[PDB]
Amino acid sequence: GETTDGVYRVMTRRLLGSTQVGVGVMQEGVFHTMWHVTKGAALRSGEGRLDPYWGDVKQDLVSYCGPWKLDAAWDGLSEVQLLAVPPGERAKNIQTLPGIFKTKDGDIGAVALDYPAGTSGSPILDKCGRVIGLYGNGVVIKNGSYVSAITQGKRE
Amino acid sequence: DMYIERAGDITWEKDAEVTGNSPRLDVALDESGDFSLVE
Numbered sequence: 581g582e583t584t585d586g587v588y589r590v591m592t593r594r595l596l597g598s599t600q601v602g603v604g605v606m607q608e609g610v611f612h613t614m615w616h617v618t619k620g621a622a623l624r625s626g627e628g629r630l631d632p633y634w635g636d637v638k639q640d641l642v643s644y645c646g647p648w649k650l651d652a653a654w655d656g657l658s659e660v661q662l663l664a665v666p667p668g669e670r671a672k673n674i675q676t677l678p679g680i681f682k683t684k685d686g687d688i689g690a691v692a693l694d695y696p697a698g699t700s701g702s703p704i705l706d707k708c709g710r711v712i713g714l715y716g717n718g719v720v721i722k723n724g725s726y727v728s729a730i731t732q733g734k735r736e
Numbered sequence: 737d738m739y740i741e742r743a744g745d746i747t748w749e750k751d752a753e754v755t756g757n758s759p760r761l762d763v764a765l766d767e768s769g770d771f772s773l774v775e
């Protein structure tokens with residue numbers, strides 16, 4: 581199947597028609613997505629099969645074909661871009677200045693952009709095009725709006 | 737059964753649409769990977 585670097589839609593034919601359940605990043609031959617998108621299930625790319633390699637429900641991340649490769653981090657100051665891949669719609673870059681999720685274990689960047697749930701797994705990029713995390717695990721605030729963490733894995 | 741389809745290259749785009757605010761929120765992360773607001 582296709583192993584070229586880039587952003588990919590994650591689809592299923594289990595429900596009515598073809599439904600986009602999420603998005604992911606192919607980098608260095610490894611596909612990266614959020615755990616809640618696939619629930620750790622195997623994926624197909626044309627005739628090829630991608631098997632899960634590493635996953636963690638608490639981080640809400642999973643990698644296929646190899647270990648997690650994304651290790652760039654938000655600098656805590658600059659604007660970033662969400663490369664949103666919405667269901668049935670073209671990939672589109674949206675620039676924003678992240679907020680912060682403050683936790684008992686440290687601070688994490690957060691993007692206040694609201695997209696359909698099937699956009700989860702879309703990468704967040706720094707000014708050099710490096711993936712600093714994936715969009716799609718977050719919270720609903722007072723006003724009903726959605727705020728996602730910039731969720732990044734660890735490259736061993 | 738789940739399958740993947742390419743949707744694009746990963747690149748920064750100059751003069752992309754600029755939107756969204758920057759909220760500072762107190763949050764908690766549970767064992768199930770769910771974030772919640774702390775007040």
Ligand SMILES: CNCc1nnc2ccccn12
Pocket residue numbers: 616694695696697698699700715716717726
């Ligand atoms: C797929 N479940 C996570 C989730 N629940 N609401 C939203 C909204 C946007 C992105 C992700 N979201």
